[model samples]
Target chain A: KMSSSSKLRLLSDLQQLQKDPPEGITASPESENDLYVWNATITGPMDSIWEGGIFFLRLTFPEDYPTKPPKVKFTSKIFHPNVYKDGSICLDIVQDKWSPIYTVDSILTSILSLLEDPNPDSPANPEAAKLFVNDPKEYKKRVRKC
Target chain B: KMSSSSKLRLLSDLQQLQKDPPEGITASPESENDLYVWNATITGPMDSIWEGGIFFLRLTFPEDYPTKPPKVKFTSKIFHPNVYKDGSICLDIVQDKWSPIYTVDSILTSILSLLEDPNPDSPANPEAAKLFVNDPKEYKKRVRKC
Candidate 1:
């Protein structure tokens, strides 16, 4: 019946995103008929190791979304300290501290920024973390290759 | 030196609130020199028992501010099911679900809305919850008296 509060909120989010899109990020539902699954892309930040890279991601929203954060994962291959081999991101906002006020635009924007400033303290990819912390030049080279 | 990231965010929040203030809510830091403590107010929703009432609140931001939800407490007495006798509120956004994206405006707006649609399931004031669930009419009367 398309009566769920989450669906209504998602619709509003979509409208807002389209009206005032964030720089370097774009997201929309996977299908016209489905508001629960979305496809997104984020361009790497300028003047960073990740510059000129295009990253694709998938977002699957829960039925009770806003109450619960959407499940987000990278669909395009890349290496980052906080991204798991399976592509899932380890971010506080997507995990324990997700608030109902967060919209898709805010989520994607956060992810986009994360690409430049990796949080090595809680690494999902230990190799990426070690390289990032121990060798700056090598880390940039490795990130470039990815 | 007012150079902490939290202070900068709070300054931006203050500016945003001033530029486009939310309906029935107002908040500002207690002193020009202190961005960590603020006073706020919320007008009850129209057509509700709480209509014509003005609720005063206090907000004390942590050193990390947005990363930690501000401590909010009602200074003006409230008789909502989710408001404790000591003026503390029981809300998800202020607790486990807090996120950095929330601002003072959003927080007070949520509290204002909570007055009309109380969450009796997680009662801070058991008496209010009982009256609200067992006898809505009496609940309205009790709320009015308060």
Candidate 2:
């Protein structure tokens, strides 16, 4: 059973995001009756290598969420240092550093921001990370191909 | 000099809060020029013993805020298990569990919620904690007097 607090908080997040969404991001539940699964899309930041790309992601909420971070993964494949081949994303907000205070809008916004500014220290894609640092030209070529 | 990211993030928070304020909460910078010092108010939750009360608080952001939790304290007196006489609050989000993803609105909302449902195990006010657990009638009386 879904906890009351989780349902209430998720409802609030849904309303807030609907009323005032973050830039280049759109998120909504997969169904109106089910708040546990959400489908979201983030447009790449302008002037970045990711520009013109539209990325799709799915967010699966746990029964105890906002208390537990949602499980987010790319449904649309892309080349990035922090994105694993399995579609999982390596982000601090969804991992060890997650706090209950974060909302869907904030989380998606962070993912969008990370597209332009990938974290090299904890790379999920070693080749992407290496090229990002050692060969900017190749990194651009690889990113544009995705 | 303030870091560009810190300043930019704080501005975004201010704008978002102003545009879509949280329930029974209001927050803004103490001065037009400074984003580090903010003054806020949280009205006690309806139907709770804290109802009808207005709580004032001060939030002091560090130079590296969002990365570090802001220093928050009650400017108006509050009689609750989690609130110290000196106005400091004993909350995990502000302490060891602090995360960069939290916003001012979310932080204030958590404090408001804490008024009625406090964590007795980590009480900042032992007397209030004792009464809350052992003497419900006395706790209501104490709370109403504040």
Candidate 3:
């Protein structure tokens, strides 16, 4: 499962994404040839708390590609239940749900939704969770501040 | 615990999502103010086989939203191991792994990852599984058509 093919797949995926970019999403390696690490950003959707914000994220691929999933987290600070103050996201796909075929743009796509939707049950911030469940109006106000 | 708050929570969450959306994802109710039945679109991640594609999905929420969970699947066509041709998506967050804290965007976030990463082990489309595991080259080509 882990092979040199990891770099091969990463490079291919990057090129393919650049060739055909999706709406409101973009990703590229930080360094010229360091495919091992990359940076990505996606704009928040309209009329959302995260709107008009560019959420920055980092992705680091391991040497063993398919066998090990890439590590991704937001570098830009965000206010959401599933996002910790540190920008770690709480989604099954990133934790217990990771799979081999995921790529830079692929994980970024999921992260975009995570930012859009917040899971209060498995909250990265307990206070945020409580606020979301108890007083959503305040939650929205707090999130908008981010 | 079921309460009027659940309905209130759902509506507020949906509104927040509609206002500040994740990149390339949009969702709305089929009927006016009927948050229970909604339609959504997740733009395919760039550079993947599903790039430049618009995937329409249907979501049916249960009366006890915070307790039970909503269901989401592709209304438009897509090719992946976790999704059936009829548009049934396979994800734990919507099943045994479901949590009431998840909103429309949360679920869609995971769906985006599902499109990027197909799980051949617990496949919804058996044909997709066999074809992908047996011949990935052909699998990529096949998904590219969708």
Which pairs, if any, clash in model 2? none
Model 2 residue B1 lDDT? Answer: 47
- Model 2 ranges with Cα > 4 A deviation: B1-146
Clashes of each: 0, 0, 7
Q: How much is the lDDT of residue B127 in candidate 1?
A: 94
TM-scores of all predicted structures? 0.48, 0.49, 0.47
Q: List the residue pairs that clash in candidate 1.
A: none
Error of 2 at B107 (Å): 36
Which residue runs of candidate 1 sit more than 4 Å off their true CA positions? A1-3, A144-146, B1-146
Candidate 1 lDDT over B48-144, as tens digits, reads: 6676555667788888877899888877677888888888889998989997899876787788788668886868999998887788789878876
Candidate 2 residue lDDT tens string, A1-146? 45788878876776555345465654556432455776666666777767656666778888899889999888767788999998899999888899889988778878888877889896999899899889888887887787
Question: Could you tell me the interface RMSD of model 3?
Answer: 14.2
Error of 3 at A125 (Å): 46
lDDT of 3 by residue, A11-50 (tens): 5665555444555554545332455766555667666656
The interface RMSD values of the models, given in order, are 18.4, 15.2, 14.2
Give lDDT: candidate 3, residue A32. Answer: 26
Which model scores highest in lDDT? Answer: 2
Candidate 2, B32-144: lDDT as tens digits: 24557766656666677676565667788888887988998887667889988898899998878988898887787788788657887968999998998898888888877
